[PDB]
């Protein structure tokens, strides 16, 4: 078996390795990268996103996310409050502001320590979720807004046509945006590629480890957690890597830099965040393997995790039992 520690994987393709996206992803499972939950992919040096990123200021964030912590340091949750509109611009000189910039440090470690020890002591600004791309239409690798779709991925292995569209999201962020600890919809894959800007931490739990991750969940938010039998799908919850050592959770971390891609493998749970002004791109995608995990993947039907458009298909099809609950969920 490869990679049985699940260890995070970092790859190196050559410019004639990153023509085949799918034949790639197929290749780093063969040497084990999914057992981690994530890897990193260094694009050859020949490639490129797009030419410079000189002109993406008067990008709109029609709807920037302030995110309020509560609880402890190690064991929290944040909700998101909705801040007025503004232009990627303004809001890289607010993420340099004296009042969120990133502090003084010595190097990634020092950082990802005053981030565990002081992030609940601040509400910082997240621009995410924003539908749209960054890459060159003439990107012809690693395109994420030229990925084959997972409704195409569901009809060549399943033969059932479905509705539904595929497109990638924008994400700014500064200095302690945080992503909670989740798995994709649908257990899904996801790829991010981490455009400009200040690198991202993060974390993952191997896929084959996950319900232990989800039952320590469940022993520190507990109300949430008589909630919702799913209640992780809400993405608010925080657990730090030192109360995961203590409870004896397996898990890794990497910190991802500018013109690096991620991947995350289906049921692998993620969290991090970010260390200064920065920009990342991504999608959801799916390959035959996924299909075993979306027919598995748990579903939140209280109301809160509410999701695309396209999900509505994944259910209906993939989990015919839960579609009605999920849907009445949804609405
Ligand atoms: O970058 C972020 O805020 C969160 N991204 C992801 O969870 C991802 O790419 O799957
Ligand atoms: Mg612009
Ligand atoms: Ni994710
Ligand atoms: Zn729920």
């Known amino acids: 078996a490869q990679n ?67 609880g402890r340091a190690g064991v929290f949750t944040q909700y998101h ?8 611009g303004e809001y890289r000189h607010l993420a340099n502001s004296k009042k969120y910039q990133t502090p003084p440090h010595q190097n990634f470690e020092d950082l990802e320590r005053k981030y565990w020890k002081n992030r609940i002591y601040n509400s910082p600004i997240y621009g995410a979720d924003i539908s749209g791309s960054l890459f060159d239409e003439n990107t012809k690798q690693w395109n994420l807004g030229h990925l084959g779709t997972i409704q195409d991925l569901l009809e060549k292995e399943c033969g059932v046509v479905i509705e539904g569209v595929n497109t990638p999201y924008l994400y700014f962020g500064m200095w302690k945006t945080t992503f909670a600890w989740h798995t994709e919809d649908m257990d899904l894959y996801s790829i991010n590629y981490l455009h400009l800007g200040e690198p991202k931490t993060w974390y993952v739990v191997p896929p084959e480890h996950g319900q232990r991750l989800e039952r320590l969940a469940r022993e520190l938010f507990p109300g949430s957690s008589r ?10 919850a925080l657990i730090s890597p030192t109360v995961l050592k203590e409870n004896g959770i397996p898990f890794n971390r990497i910190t991802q830099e500018a013109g690096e891609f991620m991947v995350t493998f289906p049921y692998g749970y993620h969290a991090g965040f970010n260390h200064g002004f920065n920009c990342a791109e991504a999608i959801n995608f799916a390959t035959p393997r996924w299909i075993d995990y979306g027919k598995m993947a748990s579903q939140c039907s209280c109301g809160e995790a509410r999701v695309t458009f396209s999900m509505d298909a994944f259910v209906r099809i993939l989990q015919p039992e839960r579609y009605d609950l999920w849907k009445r969920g949804q609405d």
């Open 4 to 70: 049985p520690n699940c260890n995070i994987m970092i790859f190196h393709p050559t410019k004639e390795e990153f023509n085949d996206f799918d034949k790639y992803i197929a290749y780093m499972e063969s040497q084990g990268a999914h057992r981690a939950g994530l890897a990193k992919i260094i694009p050859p040096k020949e490639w490129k996103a797009r030419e410079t990123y000189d002109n993406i200021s008067e990008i709109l964030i029609a709807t920037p996310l302030q995110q309020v912590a509560s």
């Open 81 to 88: 409050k909705k801040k007025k509109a503004m232009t990627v």
């Open 227 to 236: 909630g919702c039998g799913a209640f992780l799908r809400h993405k608010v």
